[PDB]
Amino acid sequence: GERVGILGAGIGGLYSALILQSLDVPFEIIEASNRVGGRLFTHKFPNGGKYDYYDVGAMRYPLPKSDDKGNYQPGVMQRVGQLFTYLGMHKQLIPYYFKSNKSPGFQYFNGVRARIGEGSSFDAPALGINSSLIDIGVTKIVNDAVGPFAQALFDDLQKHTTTGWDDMMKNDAYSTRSYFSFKYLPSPSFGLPSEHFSTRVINWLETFDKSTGWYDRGLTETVLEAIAFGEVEVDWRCIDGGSHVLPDTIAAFLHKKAFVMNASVTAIGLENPNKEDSPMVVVAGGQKRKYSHVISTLPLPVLRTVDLKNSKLDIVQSNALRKLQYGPSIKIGILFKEPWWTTGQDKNGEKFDLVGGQSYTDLPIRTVVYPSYGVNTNAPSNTLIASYCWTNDAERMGSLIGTGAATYEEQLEHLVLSNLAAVHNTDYQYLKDRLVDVHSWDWNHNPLTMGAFAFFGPGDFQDLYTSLNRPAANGKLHFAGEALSVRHAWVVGALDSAWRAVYNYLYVTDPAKLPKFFELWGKNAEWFEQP
Amino acid sequence: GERVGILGAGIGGLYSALILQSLDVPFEIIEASNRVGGRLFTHKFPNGGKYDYYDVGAMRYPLPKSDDKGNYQPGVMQRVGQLFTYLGMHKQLIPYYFKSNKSPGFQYFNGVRARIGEGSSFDAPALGINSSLIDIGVTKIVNDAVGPFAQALFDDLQKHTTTGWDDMMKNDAYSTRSYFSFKYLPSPSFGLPSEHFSTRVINWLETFDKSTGWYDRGLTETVLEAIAFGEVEVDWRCIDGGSHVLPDTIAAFLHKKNAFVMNASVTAIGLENPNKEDSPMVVVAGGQKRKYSHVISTLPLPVLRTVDLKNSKLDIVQSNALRKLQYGPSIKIGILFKEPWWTTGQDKNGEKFDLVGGQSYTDLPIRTVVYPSYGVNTNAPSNTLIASYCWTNDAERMGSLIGTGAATYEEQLEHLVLSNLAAVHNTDYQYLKDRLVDVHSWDWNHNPLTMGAFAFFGPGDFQDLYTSLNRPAANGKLHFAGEALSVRHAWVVGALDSAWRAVYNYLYVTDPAKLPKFFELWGKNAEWFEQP
Numbered sequence A: 001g002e003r004v005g006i007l008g009a010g011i012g013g014l015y016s017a018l019i020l021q022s023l024d025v026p027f028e029i030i031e032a033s034n035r036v037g038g039r040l041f042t043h044k045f046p047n048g049g050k051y052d053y054y055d056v057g058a059m060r061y062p063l064p065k066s067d068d069k070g071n072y073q074p075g076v077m078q079r080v081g082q083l084f085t086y087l088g089m090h091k092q093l094i095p096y097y098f099k100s101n102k103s104p105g106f107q108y109f110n111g112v113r114a115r116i117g118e119g120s121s122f123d124a125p126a127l128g129i130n131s132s133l134i135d136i137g138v139t140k141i142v143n144d145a146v147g148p149f150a151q152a153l154f155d156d157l158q159k160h161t162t163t164g165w166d167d168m169m170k171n172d173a174y175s176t177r178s179y180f181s182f183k184y185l186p187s188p189s190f191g192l193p194s195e196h197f198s199t200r201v202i203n204w205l206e207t208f209d210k211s212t213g214w215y216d217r218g219l220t221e222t223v224l225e226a227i228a229f230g231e232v233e234v235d236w237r238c239i240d241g242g243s244h245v246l247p248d249t250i251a252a253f254l255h256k257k258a259f260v261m262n263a264s265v266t267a268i269g270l271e272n273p274n275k276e277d278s279p280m281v282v283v284a285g286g287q288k289r290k291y292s293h294v295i296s297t298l299p300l301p302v303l304r305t306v307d308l309k310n311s312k313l314d315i316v317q318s319n320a321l322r323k324l325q326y327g328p329s330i331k332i333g334i335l336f337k338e339p340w341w342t343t344g345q346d347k348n349g350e351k352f353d354l355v356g357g358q359s360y361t362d363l364p365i366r367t368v369v370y371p372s373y374g375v376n377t378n379a380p381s382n383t384l385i386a387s388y389c390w391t392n393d394a395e396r397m398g399s400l401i402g403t404g405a406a407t408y409e410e411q412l413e414h415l416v417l418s419n420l421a422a423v424h425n426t427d428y429q430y431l432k433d434r435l436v437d438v439h440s441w442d443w444n445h446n447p448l449t450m451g452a453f454a455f456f457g458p459g460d461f462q463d464l465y466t467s468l469n470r471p472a473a474n475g476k477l478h479f480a481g482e483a484l485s486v487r488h489a490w491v492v493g494a495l496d497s498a499w500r501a502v503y504n505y506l507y508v509t510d511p512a513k514l515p516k517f518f519e520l521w522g523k524n525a526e527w528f529e530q531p
Numbered sequence B: 001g002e003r004v005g006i007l008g009a010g011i012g013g014l015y016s017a018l019i020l021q022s023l024d025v026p027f028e029i030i031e032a033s034n035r036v037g038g039r040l041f042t043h044k045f046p047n048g049g050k051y052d053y054y055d056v057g058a059m060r061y062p063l064p065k066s067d068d069k070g071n072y073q074p075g076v077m078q079r080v081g082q083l084f085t086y087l088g089m090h091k092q093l094i095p096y097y098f099k100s101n102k103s104p105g106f107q108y109f110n111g112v113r114a115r116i117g118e119g120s121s122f123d124a125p126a127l128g129i130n131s132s133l134i135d136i137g138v139t140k141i142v143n144d145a146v147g148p149f150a151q152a153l154f155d156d157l158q159k160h161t162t163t164g165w166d167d168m169m170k171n172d173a174y175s176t177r178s179y180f181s182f183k184y185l186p187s188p189s190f191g192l193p194s195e196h197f198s199t200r201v202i203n204w205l206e207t208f209d210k211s212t213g214w215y216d217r218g219l220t221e222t223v224l225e226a227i228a229f230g231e232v233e234v235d236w237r238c239i240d241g242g243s244h245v246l247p248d249t250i251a252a253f254l255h256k257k258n259a260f261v262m263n264a265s266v267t268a269i270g271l272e273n274p275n276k277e278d279s280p281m282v283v284v285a286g287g288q289k290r291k292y293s294h295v296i297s298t299l300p301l302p303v304l305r306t307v308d309l310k311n312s313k314l315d316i317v318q319s320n321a322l323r324k325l326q327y328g329p330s331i332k333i334g335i336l337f338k339e340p341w342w343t344t345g346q347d348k349n350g351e352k353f354d355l356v357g358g359q360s361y362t363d364l365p366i367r368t369v370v371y372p373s374y375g376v377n378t379n380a381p382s383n384t385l386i387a388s389y390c391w392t393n394d395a396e397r398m399g400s401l402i403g404t405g406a407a408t409y410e411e412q413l414e415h416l417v418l419s420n421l422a423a424v425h426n427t428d429y430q431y432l433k434d435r436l437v438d439v440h441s442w443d444w445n446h447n448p449l450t451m452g453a454f455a456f457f458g459p460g461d462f463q464d465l466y467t468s469l470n471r472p473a474a475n476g477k478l479h480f481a482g483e484a485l486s487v488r489h490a491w492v493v494g495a496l497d498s499a500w501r502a503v504y505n506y507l508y509v510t511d512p513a514k515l516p517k518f519f520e521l522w523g524k525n526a527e528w529f530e531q532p
């Protein structure tokens, strides 16, 4: 009969399983490792307390507003909020402070230190940035360029249209950089010369807006991220105890109602590609398993290591698996003896007075994230995310992570602490005396992810994205995972991909279940609807 | 008292040392590791014979023509050739077969297998590539777009001008992709619509021209790379015994004149007193302070970002350049087999591969296969294959399976590579597994000593930030060098050019009376052509 093989016990595969279970469709989940959650990965420090953990992957959720009952207003990540409520986790959501809840975080650029909001220029005039651009500020400039695209895409979601996406796709051959260099012109109200920005100005924008190399990726990703971050209000939330609680709770729910763990997939294909009723065959852990349909949540680079002969990918799908671009990321968590960023003071006696929030710098660590969990408890977290990098910053830092050599582990620690000391204006020894343990992770050096997440280059969305939204293997192989969405690097992207995969499965096997599917999980993947 | 501190015992630092030694300038070389050569790295398989090695980094040199005495004609890499001759290595250079010296290498794209030169379309019509584009071919299309820039830069070198570079810089904000999408129009002789290529066509070009993601990097690098590869004749050469022979020979030459400080990683560089005009330079390496009059750094830009450069007084552009000037990734996988099956073997249908040197290409994860040119005419030909050589996105993805320290992922890596090799050559997996002996793999983007394979600039890097690092720092006493400080990124000549410029600036400010001899031995210019 019908039994769906779900590849990958990440949040996308677990979500697919929730849907199928609610519709009484048999399924199995095949997972290569001994754990569920995938890129929801919470590391707990052995020497710490209840809140001495940090999330190596997902950690913050910009959700729509919600009522006391867990009903979420329409929004980009309503689907995530409704999942929490569905699992009885709404009351386990705690505030995530994107900015500090007390004094503002630090900025350290070009050797100039300041607090967020103090209006420092960070020596930009010495870089050749004229005073008019400095007065306007990076945020307003980028918003003026991204705004028109973002507003059109938000109108698509609110009004149930796709013309905004059509407009984004006519511009999808642009990177953010090439859009500034060859098309964008400043709003006349800025009083700037009606000229395209120079590379010097564009790189100044990237320095404070995103990460080194971000602007060489697709303009569309810049637009989609502004929408995801709510720059188009949102309740920033994290999960009490770490993001691991979400997949662990789903797994425990599915258990009491199967899982095939420690079985890496090496082949996917039809048993007989010339038979219309041929089942699907998945080789996992050296054993053949048969299914009617297969929903894959494996990252695209991982699928490139799987034998997909007899899955009958069309020529566009196979090229898309290779070309659709992924991005890197690293994180470094440090257990300290105390939350010095909250209770301590700098070398001149000035209190940091930081609670949650983030600090930013052009030094290699780039971004520091102070924990929001546990701040209002008897045992606040002593664990800091000392570095969180993207693109070029993550690529370079990755060479110092996971070397297995004590000499490089020591170099890494000294670099991170030194960068931290310069950002916060402390001595190196002040932080070394308080260090307990270090944990680091490079998602671009992990066979299970082969990159942090999808981060498409120019042209990817307009040319190759749609091919993987079609099924393969005579309609019996469905591609899913966060890469199959317009919310890359977000949990909602994985949830959206699972919605589409199950939709196509029901469409071809049992369309009579579509009304119930719509009723429980939404009439659309992205188009807004009330709770 | 002059004494130059050279940071890094790679080919750039060793070359700097050769120059200074020829000019009687005292120097010391500080090296973090226990070896010299840097990205010239030859791996020898212990279970193999004389030619069972492979070069993990540099392996092939497109040199100018040369005479019997080792004099090289003017060209992009004359400087490399003259270095070989200077060291008495000219007769140790052997042919490098860029294409196979017997039957052509393989191409395997979109499930279609063919030999190089057979004119296959690899199912391109099913991708939406119209027949006119296929008939013209990727090579002609890319040459038509790159040609004008490459010709102007080659004229700069021949006629001793910089207008070609100035024109290239006017277009440096383009990536190769954005140039095709928003500016390039086909030559009217192509008979194509006078319109910019679609993304589908541009990605088709990238698939057969370079590597996944190459076209999102700077257009200038694509132009400069075509000049370096000679696509604008060249004698492709490699070094008998491996590229390691070059830095080893330099080291042995310098010792009998020692000034090597090994196992001393640099952690700080700066003036002893930044407010004193006569302040010496201080280098902290291996936990020890060392003082010099001037410092020539050949450390990669990402490595300098891990060094305390306070008191080197970089200007705001230089410090940003260290962060933003982009590097690119690369991996290599070498496999020792029991026999050179690519030369003596046959596919599942009995057709002999008949490959000697050369390369095969595929859109499969391994991307490029390189058959050895060394040893092909000896009693013990090489049994060692470069089963995979990747760039950009292909190298980034493959890197996650390299250096994991887990046997399970070493096995997955081996099975993937062998499976890809079998599909490219039309053999069974077991045919290659039965012949496998040993595997060695390397990811230059997961290596603290390089932090990337080499400079691979994005759009705007050359026009905006490159020049800042061509100026010295630390009151004129810190000189930035290494292959990143050149227009020949990812080439030995780039490192040599950077050393020429660094020593030139050093001599210019400390002892200009040595310039004539410097010009006489090492060239009147870094890049502008001259006769041997």
Ligand SMILES: Cc1cc2c(cc1C)N(C[C@H](O)[C@H](O)[C@H](O)COP(=O)(O)OP(=O)(O)OC[C@H]1O[C@@H](n3cnc4c(N)ncnc43)[C@H](O)[C@@H]1O)c1[nH]c(=O)[nH]c(=O)c1N2
Pocket (backbone or CB within 6 Å): A007, A008, A009, A010, A011, A012, A013, A030, A031, A032, A033, A035, A036, A037, A038, A039, A040, A056, A057, A058, A059, A060, A061, A263, A264, A265, A266, A297, A298, A299, A302, A329, A330, A331, A443, A447, A448, A449, A451, A452, A453, A480, A481, A482, A483, A488, A489, A490, A491, A492, A493, A494
């Ligand atoms: C550093 C970092 C930071 C963030 C985020 C990611 C990262 C890397 N994200 C994004 C979010 O973590 C991500 O989009 C989803 O967790 C992806 O879920 P999937 O199910 O698509 O894949 P995921 O990769 O999580 O799951 C795939 C599963 O397949 C398994 N697998 C792999 N190869 C296999 C094989 N051969 N056979 C069988 N199984 C195999 C894996 O082990 C894994 O269990 C995020 N999101 C968010 O909402 N907020 C945030 O703040 C962040 N931040």
Ligand SMILES: Cc1cc2c(cc1C)N(C[C@H](O)[C@H](O)[C@H](O)COP(=O)(O)OP(=O)(O)OC[C@H]1O[C@@H](n3cnc4c(N)ncnc43)[C@H](O)[C@@H]1O)c1[nH]c(=O)[nH]c(=O)c1N2
Pocket (backbone or CB within 6 Å): B007, B008, B009, B010, B011, B012, B013, B030, B031, B032, B033, B035, B036, B037, B038, B039, B040, B056, B057, B058, B059, B060, B061, B264, B265, B266, B267, B298, B299, B300, B303, B330, B331, B332, B444, B448, B449, B450, B453, B454, B481, B482, B483, B484, B489, B490, B491, B492, B493, B494, B495
């Ligand atoms: C995979 C691959 C393939 C190729 C090539 C590179 C790579 C990575 N190249 C390019 C060529 O290898 C490269 O451009 C030069 O070797 C670079 O020499 P440098 O001296 O500039 O740096 P390189 O990196 O070689 O040397 C720097 C030195 O500094 C040391 N160091 C690092 N950190 C330090 C610290 N903190 N303190 C002290 N010392 C430190 C390093 O250990 C090293 O000895 C090439 N070229 C070519 O001509 N033909 C080819 O075919 C190829 N192919």
Ligand SMILES: N[C@@H](CCC(=O)O)C(=O)O
Pocket (backbone or CB within 6 Å): A060, A225, A488, A489, A490
């Ligand atoms: N969404 C993740 C990853 C970055 C991104 O969204 O692009 C974050 O909040 O950091």
Ligand SMILES: N[C@@H](CCC(=O)O)C(=O)O
Pocket (backbone or CB within 6 Å): B060, B225, B228, B489, B490, B491
């Ligand atoms: N030069 C090296 C690296 C690639 C490049 O030059 O860009 C090679 O021949 O493979």
